Amino acid sequence: ELQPVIEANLSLNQNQLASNGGYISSQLGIRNESCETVKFKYWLSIKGPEGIYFPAKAVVGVDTAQGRMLNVTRGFWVPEYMADGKYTVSLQVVAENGKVFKANQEFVKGVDLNSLPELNGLTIDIKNQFGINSVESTGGFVPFTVDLNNGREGEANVEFWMTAVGPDGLIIPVNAREKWVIASGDTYSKVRGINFDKSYPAGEYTINAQVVDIVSGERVEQSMTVVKK
Amino acid sequence: PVIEANLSLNQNQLASNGGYISSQLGIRNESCETVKFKYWLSIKGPEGIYFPAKAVVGVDTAGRMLNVTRGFWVPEYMADGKYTVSLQVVAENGKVFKANQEFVKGVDLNSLPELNGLTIDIKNQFGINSVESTGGFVPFTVDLNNGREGEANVEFWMTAVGPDGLIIPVNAREKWVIASGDTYSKVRGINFDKSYPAGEYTINAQVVDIVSGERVEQSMTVVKK
Fold it and tell me: Backbone phi, then psi, for A168, in 5-degree steps?
């Protein structure tokens, strides 16, 4: 009916685990509503803190069919030893013609679902300022806000930096490593952008910010996706 | 070509308390035409670490050669393990050039990754660094040698982290019991279907000691043309 070849969707039965982990049941929906049938491969994977990536469901090839609808329930355990923090579950589909379709859902382990990432009282609030998820192939610019609020009774000493982790193994500097001293009660604020020059390769860029407490050595990250068309 | 990139480090091995590394950057334009590009210096480390060492700079050979010295501190609090320093260049026409050097922190330079006596030896079996755009298959060897006195209990898995945010399962999570003195060995490959997008895939193996909770990683690159 002149529609997209594939529509993927994903829901999780639950999305906040305690520190000792637990089980999450995923519902996977893949529909082929377009006029013609389609072949694709799909799978389910998870991205986590500290460079964690793990599979939840193996690659399966589908000829749909002989339109058609696909509904799968797939559960997975998240063991206690996996790092506490934010996780993304991603149902991923690649069509025969190379088109990629993804449906993502987030869950958290050991932290509150809506709480800011933090280093023991120092909260780290880093955002895509205007919610700009992609830029034209001819180039675009995306600003990020950075607000660190020190809720400790003592001053905080952190090191901060940002990169854009992209196609072709590119790791583009976004913010050089800086050291900040943040008095108790104060908030360190800045805005920092990245120009995606037209020459940069098309694909997905992970804008990655990292903050380290220089005293404790504790490190926390905030990742944000921008696609260059 | 149009661009040649070269990178060297004055030091390869850091103790856990960190240290300072000086790098020599070389970018050469042998091409018959002058060339316009941007370059920078970045580091990939363990546990999701990425950090910059030299900001984006626009350059127009107006060809000729560029030589730069660039040092950087690696403080004590950065995770021990294996780091990759990468001089990267993107020319005006979108062509990408990279020169890489490895360094280590708190571990021997030529040491297998390990979990306290249990060594993890994971390799691209036949040294196949790329596959055609019409598709190819790459097998990997997996050898876990338990040097400990007691048995080891681990969970193991692999994915391929690729373009377009793809995270393709390569080996499902499985749990192994490895007696003292024994080696667990397998071979596991990944098919890069024709339909998968062109670009860089990181084949990523992770192994967790179920008892200690300690996790270690081995990454290997395959490029789909």
Answer: 60, 30
Experimental method: X-ray
Assign domain A117-229 to its CATH architecture: Sandwich (2.60)
Inter-chain residue contact B86 with A221, CB threshold 8 Å:
no
Whether residues A41 and B195 touch (CB distance < 8 A) is answered with yes
Q: Maximum distance among all alpha carbons in chain B? A: 65
Domain boundaries, chain B: 1-112, 113-225
From the list B38, B52, B94, which residue is nearest A176 (CB)?
B52
B129: left (phi over 0), alpha (psi -120 to 50) or beta: alpha
CATH architecture of B113-225: Sandwich (2.60)
Please list every residue in chain B whose beta carbon sits closer than 8 Å to the beta carbon of residue A53.
Answer: 159, 161, 167, 204, 206
Partnered with residue A185 across adjacent β-strands are none
**Resolution value, angstrom units:** 2.2
Backbone angles phi, psi at A68, to 5 degrees: 175, 155
A chain contacts of residue B196, beta-carbon cutoff 8 Å: 94, 98
Please state whether B78 falls in left (phi above 0), alpha (psi between -120 and 50) or beta: beta
Contact A57, A44 (CB under 8 A): yes
Q: To the nearest whole angstrom, how far is the Cα of A55 from the nearest Cα of chain B?
A: 5
Buried b / exposed e along A40-55 (16+ C-beta atoms within 10 A): bbbbbbbbbbbbbbbb
> Is there a shared CATH topology between the B1-112 domain and the B113-225 domain?
yes
Gaps in chain B after residue (C–N beyond 2.5 Å):
62
Class of domain A1-116: mainly beta
Distance from CA of A164 to the nearest CA of B (A): 9
What is the CATH number assigned to the segment(s) B1-112?
2.60.40.3880
